[PDB]
Ligand binder design. Sequence first.
Ligand code: MG
Ligand code: ZN
Ligand code: ZN
Ligand code: ZN
Ligand code: ZN
Lengths: 240, 147, 48, 79, 49, 140, 148, 34, 96, 257, 115, 44, 64, 545
Amino acid sequence: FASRHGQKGTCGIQYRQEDMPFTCEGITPDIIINPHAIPSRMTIGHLIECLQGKVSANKGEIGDATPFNDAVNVQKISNLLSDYGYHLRGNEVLYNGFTGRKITSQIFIGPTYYQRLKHMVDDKIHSRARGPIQILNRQPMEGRSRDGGLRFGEMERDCQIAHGAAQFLRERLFEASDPYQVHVCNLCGIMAIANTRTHTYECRGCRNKTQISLVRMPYACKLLFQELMSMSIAPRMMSV
Amino acid sequence: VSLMRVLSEKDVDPVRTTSNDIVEIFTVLGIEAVRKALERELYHVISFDGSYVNYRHLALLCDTMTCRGHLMAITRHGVNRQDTGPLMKCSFEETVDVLMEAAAHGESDPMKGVSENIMLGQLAPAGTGCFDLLLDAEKCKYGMEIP
Amino acid sequence: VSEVSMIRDIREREIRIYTDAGRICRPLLIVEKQKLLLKKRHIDQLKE
Amino acid sequence: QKRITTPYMTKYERARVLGTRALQIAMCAPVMVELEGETDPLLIAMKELKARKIPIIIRRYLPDGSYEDWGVDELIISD
Amino acid sequence: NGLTDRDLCELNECPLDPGGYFIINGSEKVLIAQEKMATNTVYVFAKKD
Amino acid sequence: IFHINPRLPSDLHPIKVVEGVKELSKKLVIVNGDDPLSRQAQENATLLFNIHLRSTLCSRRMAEEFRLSGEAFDWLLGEIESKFNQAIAHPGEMVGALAAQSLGEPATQMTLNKNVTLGVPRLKELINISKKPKTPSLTV
Amino acid sequence: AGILFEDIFDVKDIDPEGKKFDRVSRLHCESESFKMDLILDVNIQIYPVDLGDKFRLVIASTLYEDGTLDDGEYNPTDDRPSRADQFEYVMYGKVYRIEGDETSTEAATRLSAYVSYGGLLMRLQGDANNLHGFEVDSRVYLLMKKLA
Amino acid sequence: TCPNHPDAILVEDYRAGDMICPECGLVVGDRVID
Amino acid sequence: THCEIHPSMILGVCASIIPFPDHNQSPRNTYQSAMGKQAMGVYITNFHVRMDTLAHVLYYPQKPLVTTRSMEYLRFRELPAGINSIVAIASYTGYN
Amino acid sequence: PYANQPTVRITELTDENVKFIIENTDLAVANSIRRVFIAEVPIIAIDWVQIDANSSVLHDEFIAHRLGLIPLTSDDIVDKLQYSRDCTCEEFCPECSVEFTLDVRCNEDQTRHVTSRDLISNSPRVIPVTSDDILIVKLRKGQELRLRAYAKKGFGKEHAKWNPTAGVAFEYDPDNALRHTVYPKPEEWPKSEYSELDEDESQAPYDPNGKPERFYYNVESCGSLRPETIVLSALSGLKKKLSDLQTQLSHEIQSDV
Amino acid sequence: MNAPPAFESFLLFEGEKKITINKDTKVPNACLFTINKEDHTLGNIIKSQLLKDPQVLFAGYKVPHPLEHKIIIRVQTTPDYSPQEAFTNAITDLISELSLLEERFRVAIKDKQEG
Amino acid sequence: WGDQQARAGVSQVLNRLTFASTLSHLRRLNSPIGRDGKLAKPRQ
Amino acid sequence: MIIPVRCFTCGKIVGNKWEAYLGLLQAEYTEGDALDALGLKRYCCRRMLLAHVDLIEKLLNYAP
Amino acid sequence: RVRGNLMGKRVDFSARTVITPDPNLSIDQVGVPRSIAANMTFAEIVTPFNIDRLQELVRRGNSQYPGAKYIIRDNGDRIDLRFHPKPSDLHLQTGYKVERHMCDGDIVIFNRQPTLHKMSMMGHRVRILPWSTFRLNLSVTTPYNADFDGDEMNLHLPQSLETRAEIQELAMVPRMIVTPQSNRPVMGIVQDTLTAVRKFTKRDVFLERGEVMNLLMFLSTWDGKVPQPAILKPRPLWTGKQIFSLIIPGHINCIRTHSTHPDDEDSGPYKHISPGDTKVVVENGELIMGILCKKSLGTSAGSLVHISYLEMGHDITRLFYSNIQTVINNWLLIEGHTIGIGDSIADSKTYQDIQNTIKKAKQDVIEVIEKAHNNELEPTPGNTLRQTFENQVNRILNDARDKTGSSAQKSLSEYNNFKSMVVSGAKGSKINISQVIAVVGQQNVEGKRIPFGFKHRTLPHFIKDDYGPESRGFVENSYLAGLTPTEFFFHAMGGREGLIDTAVKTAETGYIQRRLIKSMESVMVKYDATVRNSINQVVQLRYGE
RNA sequence: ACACCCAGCCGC
Ligand SMILES: [Mg+2]
Ligand SMILES: [Zn+2]
Ligand SMILES: [Zn+2]
Ligand SMILES: [Zn+2]
Ligand SMILES: [Zn+2]
């Protein structure tokens, strides 16, 4: 929800009317925003709009907020607000909604135009647990629309080296993304032929059928080395 | 900057005339001197915001740029030129060119860094990965055997 | 036509009269010896 | 005697030793300490670390190839 | 062009619709005004390198 | 902790303070071993902390302003040992990535571009060796 | 009797540096019998004081007049009477500093006790012969009652 | 192709990413593609 | 020789709906200009007979109780984009 | 029993205001009574809408939402009905429900306003309160709105359509003697309605040995209940909640030792 | 998608208990009352009524989370009068308060309506 | 904007989200300066 | 799109008070006096009636 | 492939959601929506003393949260539970794996982009709350550089007990409070809790018995004894310092100074008895005097929370953060905090002083332009005449702005909330006050003043070659007074300059980050304590020498 | 039921 002066904010809690504060006339705030929104953002226009809103709602007209107008000084708005039984400058004594006690700081309250932005949280919430994967590399797909997985990116990797968590970094980049196993000849470090049904393992080339190493390795790195061997570069996976 | 001729001039202090040009400090005053100058310039650049960065990260950065005698740029032309290993140097930038160089010269990557072990999915030699956990049987025979 | 630019360069003696698509213009009132030509008659006629 | 390492169990050592012990206890390894009402293996792992009765020895690689075998019992814990 | 508000409402088109946008395949396509250096006029620039 | 009132005379013999700070100085170690290079490296590695420890825990200051007792001084020695041994950098720690992020995180906060250049362009001009600086200068 | 200090005082100033707080006033008082200087923060909202007012201070270890230490917990269900029943304005706080004119050779001549009532301060400055009850990090009670 | 269940069609779960049996819930093939 | 008709015409469309923009900070005027295009409301009156791919329609759009005189012409009095909320700038529980 | 004796007075009593003053009681009691005004007073409002046909310019959820906020007269009937989750009925029964039928259709050139008068209730004890009429939807020629609605009994905690009040105003200690709010500049603050001080003074002097025992109310009815009945049912509901807590703790103490 | 049912703020499903008593072992003769599915409305009045009792040394309440619906009322009395008895006395005192106030309000309605 | 190296993004789908969005999208301009370029002067 | 049945802030019924308010604008009254003739004392309901747009009248122009 | 699918890969078991605050959670806790909890799973291994729970979790199924999802037997086959309503396969024995739903107490990694440093990825414990947002503690937002204006933020769940242990013992929030970046606590009290504790620890604040027992309900680490009041006889009242002394953990000892501490007070006679409580001198467990602010309770080095972490470990510091944010917030329910028009208004004397100072500055600028026009104002050495005149004008306007800012902030009352939020250090500064109340001031584009965009003038409302304080850009008005249109446009340029800075600087600093890390990412501390890189070369003999 | 290309927008 955004005011008309660049005061962004998501809704954090929803309290009922018995939990809202209230004036001496039973006015509860529809929206409560922190004072910390406006000591560093200079949006005094928010306060002046709120003051003119109180004056306009009490008087019975739509107030004027034309830029560069010299008849709408804040002292004039304050003097008009004084005529309707309220404080000179905005404030009004609120009572605590829970304990019923007076608040010993007079809260600045009044009407202010708010806008609901397109960004609702039900359109952004997203989660995955071993969903669909891509064709090219067997990594999780991209984006909420496809039940896809978040990128654990290059900077995430780097801060995980900074922490020193080797196993967590491996679990994010091996176990939870694309686990895979390959069979590699021991003499030449080249991906061999494996027959998981008949258990007949052979390195075409060397005519080796005796020793073959199993390697746990990501599918993306397998595709990397297969594209290297497509371009006549041989990454030899020598495990000795 | 004409630092050496300025130092040679009469009636200027020859022990404290320091400039902010890194390469002239290197060519005139040495490698430890340019390490100290690079320290002082990197500390001077973090001064106007008032934020203090600890003197064990500036020193490490300066020792990495002044380790190999020649002053080391933090670009491909200085990080890919030191003889670390092809798989980190292709993970930084200029990927296919470093792989061609390694293929053509027959480079043998010893897998001793963290980035190589990351990209092949095995346990990286990180903070908790520089270990070797072993099981002892002398201590294991003790205790209560509930399950 | 009313959209035509008319600029005189005093110090360099240039009277550029650009009449082409793409120039960006604003309507401004005309001051003629420190008096607006927008008298009360124009406002009274525009109010009807 | 050929033991030029720190005699203090590092935080990474604590993390991975508790992790290995917790996974082992989850796979039905005998517990070296009495049980008085924990279910999750991590709490059992912390209790075994505090009791210094873990059956784990760690091998530290010096940066020249030589190793050093330490017992977690003979190390110094961080609390 | 030149239609009253009642005729616009009878045509199932909003009378407050500003217009100035094409319809292609049913998608409402608008052209944003590009901008270039003015033609037929001489400039003098100082390239600092 | 020991409820030391700084008005009454203490029961702390200053030679016990001197041997205590010497014993603590010997016992806390960064470079271990018994070699003429090892002793030199250990003395140099803790030189500033040893000067500060000898200055703060000197006999005159502790008999004039701190007025600690024997039990309080023994607890002080033990706690200094414990905190120093806790503060030693752990093996395996990636100080490189930690240093790089702890340098570059004070780079997203200062501004961009009678003084020399300063900010992100200065950082870019420093970590690159930059054979043609924009405003190189001396200080004579 | 467990009384550290006992004397009457007279107010000379109210806000010498300005009224820094709305509900607390920093009285500057001097004695007339033992020559005791004093600067004390008083809750002016519940106990108004004026210039020229006279009032008596008892600084005591306990309110219980029996030597039984109360250990500093709030127990209102105590039927056995206290010193606070005879006074109109009492307080409580830790002493945190005993400054003085001590030299390396010369012993103490004038002592000043700084006492903290959970934020409300006082300095009791005077002769060293009558501040022997004060010792650093100890709990004392302030006693007040106005006199005509 | 479910074991212990000859002639059983497999519900393809394009959300959960598996091929799943409507008698016992075994999975044939560890992941689905597309 | 010339005169501005009214200086509030230097502002655009979405910055014209800002009330008292001369009292704000310019980055916040820029932000409100950027998110005014994202505020939901009755986007067009014939939204019943148009079926776009996305559409957000607010139940109770309200004309701004503090209006700029320039947005009499933007038709913002007729297709508004928000509600006048009773707003108390306060610290209540720590959820704001 | 350490309980004091509150008293009441009534200033004026209209059909929409029951303005009363409570004396000699705690602040917490008065605040909880105000919260029970807002929340814990049951009335009857529509909660089960079934749209048979809706060709209006407003969609179905909007019509249902505007039907839920229509107040219904519940002067005596709410105390005898039950909650639909606390009854033996299958889905809805006339023991805890009231039926509503709306079969409006416009076949005239002029626009037709579907006011609350067109809701035909089943039991003639509940009705829309304006029987100045609450319109639901405007219709043109050839538009119909056919629906059946069921109205339950519910608290204001569950939804604000069951809130019987219309902005209860609760003020205590009007002349600011007991310093519970501190004015930075007291003389510029207006004196409230129940003020005893004159125009010259700003606030009453501080009272050290003082507690607030005076509470002014402006309980205003939306229309569902008479303003008598809101208070006379709020006190009963608070008493019922405290009695439920009492018997639950008695059952807890019985099965304790 | 994750909105709770609007009746969950005041309704107990099958299994959960309305009130529980937990003896607190930090200090002697103190109890925690975990009243479920209720809000500040009873917490404030119960706290005030227990504060009015002169033989109660501590009487407080908290709501641990506004999105949850528990209140925890901690009571500590003298070692002569059990805290459960204090809570019982407070509840029955508030019953007397509300009943007497209801009777006086009904008399006030009758007196204003008669003339 | 060509017969398929020409200008790109000249024509956009109209931003029917609110009336102000529609007006601000119809009255928009666009500079051809390469948007990824780390310049400073033309953006001011 | 249409006048709300209840005020958002307090809860006072303002659904029935739209048409008559328009009548008081057709009877050459100021908006403040028109609001005061309805009993809308609190400024929340004055915000409701004063700042409302009757977009349903615009929607009724189109054929059903 | 290498950068985009080897260094950084999409992962399973990850969630992303908009974040909202939660002051009722500990700093090591994160709120998780129910749908994310039911979707993401943890694979627990059936040990011989948890079958009684996992059987119930399986029997609940995938639609009865907290329930369970797929069962993995010893063979490796995955029985589904959402889709299998049969009773035969629900039985579990020893060695099985149950992919149960995420419950309370599950360790997660919780991350925000850009992941600038090690504090941007910390681990939390999961608390299930019934709405659709990730809820953090407030003080946790400072290391993440987060706020709740629409920030989305990521969730990762380990499913192996070694990974859960590594996060629990290396990447927890309390363990990772003090950064090695600056040897200062990167966490800290912020916003309302910071600006109310300044109110809470002032000398004038007293609490009656009811609100003391209300506040002590929220103190989790409380021994159970109500302390003795500071004032007893007229009415039992507690100062806020005693309540915060109960909040203070253990027996830490710190000395800090308040923001408004006078500099010469150390030379004054009342050196150790502050007349404004500006010296936080917290003794053995008790905050005996002092007013808390950013300098004493925030993220500064050597602050009180830094002392707490260095003395009492990390769990006690977690409880310290939670206790501050739980007690001070519930006191702020009573005290309340606002800001309004009346906090931006000074009296007529202050406005007259500002107007007189601005008129004097304008007259002096006109005088120095007239002096520079007639061949006077000889140039300073090392600068041209134009630069000398511009520096003279900038110096005059800077002194005028500083003087009128001092005049504006001198007239603030005690109750002015702008002051109450600046001196606490919660948000804002004195420059903000001077801009709101006094003139906004000189506004610069690329360092210099507003350039002559037109021919010899800045706007077509000014005469040609006008170097005054109105044409070249200098606001003579406040924010509350309103900007006349020329300086409104100049303010737009001034804001646009910072907007370009914030929009261009990211693309450079992200590349600097990437090159700096990839230069030294294998540089570690080996077990002989010699800092060495990948190919075993000594960089330092000891870390940090 | 995709895969590229383009555009817009969110947080810093
Ligand atoms: Mg944000
Ligand atoms: Zn082979
Ligand atoms: Zn099957
Ligand atoms: Zn029924
Ligand atoms: Zn209202």
